[PDB]
PDB file of C-alpha atoms in Angstrom:
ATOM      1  CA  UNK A   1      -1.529  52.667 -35.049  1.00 32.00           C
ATOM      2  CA  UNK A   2      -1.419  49.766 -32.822  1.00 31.69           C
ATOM      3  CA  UNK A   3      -4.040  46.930 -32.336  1.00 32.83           C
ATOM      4  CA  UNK A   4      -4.875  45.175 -29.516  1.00 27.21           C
ATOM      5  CA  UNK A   5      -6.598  42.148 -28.377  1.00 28.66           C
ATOM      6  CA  UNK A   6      -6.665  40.567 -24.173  1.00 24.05           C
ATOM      7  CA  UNK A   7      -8.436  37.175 -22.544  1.00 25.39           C
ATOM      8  CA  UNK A   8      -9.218  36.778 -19.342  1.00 24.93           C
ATOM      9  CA  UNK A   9     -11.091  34.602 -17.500  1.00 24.65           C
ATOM     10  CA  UNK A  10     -11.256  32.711 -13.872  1.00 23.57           C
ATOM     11  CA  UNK A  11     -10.904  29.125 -12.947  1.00 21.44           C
ATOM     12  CA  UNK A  12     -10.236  26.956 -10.158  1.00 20.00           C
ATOM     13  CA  UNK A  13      -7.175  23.896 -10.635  1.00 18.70           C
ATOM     14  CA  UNK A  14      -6.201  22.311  -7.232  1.00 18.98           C
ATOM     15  CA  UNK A  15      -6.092  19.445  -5.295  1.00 17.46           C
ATOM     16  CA  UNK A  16      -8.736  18.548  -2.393  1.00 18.36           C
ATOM     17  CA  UNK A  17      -8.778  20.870   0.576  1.00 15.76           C
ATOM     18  CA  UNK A  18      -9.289  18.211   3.135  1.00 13.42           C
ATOM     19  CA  UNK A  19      -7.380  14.342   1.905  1.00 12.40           C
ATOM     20  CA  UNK A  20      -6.156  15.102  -1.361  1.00 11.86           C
ATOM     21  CA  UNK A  21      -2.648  14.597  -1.857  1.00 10.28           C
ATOM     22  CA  UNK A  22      -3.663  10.597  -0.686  1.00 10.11           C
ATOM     23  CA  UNK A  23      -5.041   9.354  -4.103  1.00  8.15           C
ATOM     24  CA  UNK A  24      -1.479   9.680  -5.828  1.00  7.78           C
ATOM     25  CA  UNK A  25       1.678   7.293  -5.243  1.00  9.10           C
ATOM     26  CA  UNK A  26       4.891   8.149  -7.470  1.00 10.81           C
ATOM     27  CA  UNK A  27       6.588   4.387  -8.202  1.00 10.52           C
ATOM     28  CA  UNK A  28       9.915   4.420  -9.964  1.00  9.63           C
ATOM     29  CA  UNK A  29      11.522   1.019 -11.514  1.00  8.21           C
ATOM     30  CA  UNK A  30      14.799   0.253 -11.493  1.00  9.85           C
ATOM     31  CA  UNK A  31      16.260  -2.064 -13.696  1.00  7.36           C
ATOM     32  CA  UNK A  32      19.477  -3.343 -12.396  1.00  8.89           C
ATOM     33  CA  UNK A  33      19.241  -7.263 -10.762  1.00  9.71           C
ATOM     34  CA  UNK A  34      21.875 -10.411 -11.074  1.00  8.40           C
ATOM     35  CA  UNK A  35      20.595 -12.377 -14.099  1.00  7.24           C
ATOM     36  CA  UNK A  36      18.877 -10.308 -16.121  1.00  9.43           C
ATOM     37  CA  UNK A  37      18.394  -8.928 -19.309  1.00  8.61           C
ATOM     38  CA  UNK A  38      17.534  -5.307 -20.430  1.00  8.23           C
ATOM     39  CA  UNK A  39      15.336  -4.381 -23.460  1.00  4.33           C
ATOM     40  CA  UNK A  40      17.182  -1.163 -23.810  1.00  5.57           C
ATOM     41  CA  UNK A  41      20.825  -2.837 -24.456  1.00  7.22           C
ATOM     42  CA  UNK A  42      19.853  -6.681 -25.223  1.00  8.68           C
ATOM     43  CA  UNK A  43      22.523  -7.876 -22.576  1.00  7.62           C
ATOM     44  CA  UNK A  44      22.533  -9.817 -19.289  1.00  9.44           C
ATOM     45  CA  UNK A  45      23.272  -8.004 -16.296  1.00 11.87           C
ATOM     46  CA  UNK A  46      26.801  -9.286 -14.311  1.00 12.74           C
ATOM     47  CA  UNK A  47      25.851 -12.941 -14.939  1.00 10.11           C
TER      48      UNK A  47
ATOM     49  CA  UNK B   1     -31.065  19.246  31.967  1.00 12.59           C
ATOM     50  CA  UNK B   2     -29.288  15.775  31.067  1.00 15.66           C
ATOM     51  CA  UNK B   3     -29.720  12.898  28.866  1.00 14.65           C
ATOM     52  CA  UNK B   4     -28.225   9.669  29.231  1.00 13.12           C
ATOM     53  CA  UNK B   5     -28.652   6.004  27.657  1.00 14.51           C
ATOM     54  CA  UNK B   6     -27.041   2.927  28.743  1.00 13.46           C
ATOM     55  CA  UNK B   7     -26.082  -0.694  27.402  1.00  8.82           C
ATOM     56  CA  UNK B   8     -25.335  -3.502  29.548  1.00  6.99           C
ATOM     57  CA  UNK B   9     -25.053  -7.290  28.968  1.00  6.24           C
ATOM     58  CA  UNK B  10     -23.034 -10.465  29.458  1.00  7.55           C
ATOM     59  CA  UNK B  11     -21.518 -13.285  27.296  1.00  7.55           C
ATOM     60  CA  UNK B  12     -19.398 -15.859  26.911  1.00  4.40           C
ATOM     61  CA  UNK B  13     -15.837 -15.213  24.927  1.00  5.17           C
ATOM     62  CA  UNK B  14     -13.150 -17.063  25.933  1.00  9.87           C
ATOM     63  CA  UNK B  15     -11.068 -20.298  24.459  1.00  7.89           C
ATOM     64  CA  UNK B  16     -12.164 -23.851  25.540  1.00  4.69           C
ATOM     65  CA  UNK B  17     -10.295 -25.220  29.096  1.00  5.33           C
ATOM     66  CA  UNK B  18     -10.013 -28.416  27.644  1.00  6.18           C
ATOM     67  CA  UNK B  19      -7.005 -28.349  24.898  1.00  6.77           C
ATOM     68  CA  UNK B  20      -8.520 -25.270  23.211  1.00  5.70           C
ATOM     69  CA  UNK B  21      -4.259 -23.823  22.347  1.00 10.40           C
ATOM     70  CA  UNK B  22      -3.737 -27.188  20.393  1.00 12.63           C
ATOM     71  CA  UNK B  23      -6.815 -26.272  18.014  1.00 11.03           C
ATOM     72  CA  UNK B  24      -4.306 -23.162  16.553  1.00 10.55           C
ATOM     73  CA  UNK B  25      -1.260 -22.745  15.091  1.00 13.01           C
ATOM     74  CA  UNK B  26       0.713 -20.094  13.599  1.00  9.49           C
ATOM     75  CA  UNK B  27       2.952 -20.050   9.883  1.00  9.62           C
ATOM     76  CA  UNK B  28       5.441 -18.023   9.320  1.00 13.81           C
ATOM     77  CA  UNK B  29       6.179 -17.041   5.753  1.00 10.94           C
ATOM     78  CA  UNK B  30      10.116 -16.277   5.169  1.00 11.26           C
ATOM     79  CA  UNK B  31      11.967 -15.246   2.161  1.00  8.76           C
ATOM     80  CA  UNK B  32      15.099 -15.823   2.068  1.00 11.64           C
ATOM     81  CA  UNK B  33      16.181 -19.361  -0.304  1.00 12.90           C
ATOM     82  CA  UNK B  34      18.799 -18.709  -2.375  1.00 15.05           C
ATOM     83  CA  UNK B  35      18.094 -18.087  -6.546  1.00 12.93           C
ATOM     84  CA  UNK B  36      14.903 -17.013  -6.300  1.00 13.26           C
ATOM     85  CA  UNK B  37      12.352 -14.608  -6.738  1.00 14.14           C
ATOM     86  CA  UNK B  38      11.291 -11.545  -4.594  1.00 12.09           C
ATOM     87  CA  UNK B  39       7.549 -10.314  -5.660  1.00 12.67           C
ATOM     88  CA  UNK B  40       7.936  -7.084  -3.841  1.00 14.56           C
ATOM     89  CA  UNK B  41      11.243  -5.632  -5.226  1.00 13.75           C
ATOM     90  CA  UNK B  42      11.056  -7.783  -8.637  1.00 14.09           C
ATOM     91  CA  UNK B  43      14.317  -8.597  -8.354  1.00 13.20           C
ATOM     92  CA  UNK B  44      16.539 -11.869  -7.695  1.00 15.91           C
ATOM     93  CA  UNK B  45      16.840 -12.334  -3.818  1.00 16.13           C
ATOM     94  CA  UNK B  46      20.352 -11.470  -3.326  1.00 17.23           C
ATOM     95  CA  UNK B  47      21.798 -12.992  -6.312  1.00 19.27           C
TER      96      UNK B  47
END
């Protein structure tokens, strides 16, 4: 008295054997700088 | 059993005897002025 019921299936999700990792930069902003102001807070910055 | 193709010629490439260094100079950009603004790191240049 138990029912049952599966997927499966096959698929392909990877990056370029040959130059692939190339087409991707990772930028990360800081927000700390002498006279400024931040949206986050509404204050200047040691100034 | 060997193939082989060849390219030969002459020309003329070479700055002019007579004052040709005076025709050139060279500018160097610097970044360093005090209160301002640095485009690559978006932040004041050192306060």
């Amino acid at each position: 008295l138990v029912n049952r019921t599966t997927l499966w299936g096959s698929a392909i999700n990877d990056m370029h054997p040959r130059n692939g990792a190339d087409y991707f930069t990772r930028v990360t902003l800081t927000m700390a700088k002498k006279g400024g102001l931040n949206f986050i807070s509404g204050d200047t910055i040691d100034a």
